[PDB]
From a paper:
The [name] [name] domain was then co-crystallised with a 12-mer phosphopeptide corresponding to [name] [name] and flanking residues (designated below as +1, +2…. and −1, −2… relative to pTyr). The crystal structure of this complex was solved to 1.9 Å resolution, revealing that the [name] [name] domain adopts a typical [name] domain fold comprising three central β-strands flanked by two α-helices. In addition, there is a short helix similar to that found in the SOCS and STAT proteins located just outside the [name] domain boundary on the N-terminal side. A leucine in this helix (Leu330) begins an LSxYP motif conserved across all three SH2B family members and inserts its sidechain into a hydrophobic pocket on this surface. The pTyr of the [name] inserts into the canonical phosphotyrosine binding pocket of the [name] [name] domain, formed by Arg 343, Arg 364, Ser 366, Arg 369, His 385 and Arg 387. The phosphate moiety of [name] forms hydrogen bonds with the invariant Arg 364 and the highly conserved Arg 343 along with the backbone amide nitrogen of Glu 367, and the sidechain of Ser 368. Glu 814 of the [name] peptide (P + 1) appears to be a key determinant of binding as it forms a hydrogen bond with Lys 384 of [name]. In addition, Leu 816 (P + 3) inserts into a hydrophobic pocket common in [name] domains that is formed by Leu 386, Val 398, Leu 401, Phe 403, Phe 413, Ile 418 and Leu 420 of [name]. In both, the phosphate group of [name] occupies the canonical phosphotyrosine binding pocket and is coordinated by an invariant arginine (Arg 364 in [name]), however in [name], Arg 369 and 387 are involved in a hydrogen bonding network with Glu 372, and do not interact with the phosphate moiety. The [name] [name]/[name] [name] structure suggests that +1 and +3 residues contribute to high affinity binding.
The SH2B family of adaptor proteins, [name]-B, APS, and [name] are key modulators of cellular signalling pathways. Here we present two crystal structures of the [name] substrate recognition domain, the [name] domain, bound to phosphorylated motifs from [name] and EPOR, and biochemically define the basis for target recognition. The [name] [name] domain, unlike APS but similarly to [name]-B, adopts a monomeric structure and binds its target sequences in a canonical linear, extended conformation.
Author numbering:
A (entry chain B): 5 to 9
B (entry chain A): 325 to 437
Amino acid sequence: YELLT
Amino acid sequence: QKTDHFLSCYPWFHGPISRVRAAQLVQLQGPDAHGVFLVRQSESRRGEYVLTFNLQGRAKHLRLVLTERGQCRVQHLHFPSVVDMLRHFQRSPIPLECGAACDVRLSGYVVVL
């Protein structure tokens, strides 16, 4: 699952 | 579910499709489909949702949490609705942790059957 910065 | 009934009016909502199927749906047209997305239920976190999208041919998956009133939370970001979240990412890039080579705005979507 992608993580935002 | 109750929350998933209002999402079911949208052409880009695919409900309970698997991660793998959603990936292949958005990857079908290759890098020509950069930015193409769909929204589905999460299979690993029941009740949560996922934005699956094409980033230069590869599928990415971003968790979406819907509140009781239908507000949409994407980690630190908050949006009044799922639709507002989609429209936002159509006109500003998704701030993914992989930064530079990971520049993407949402374009079209995979229409549910």
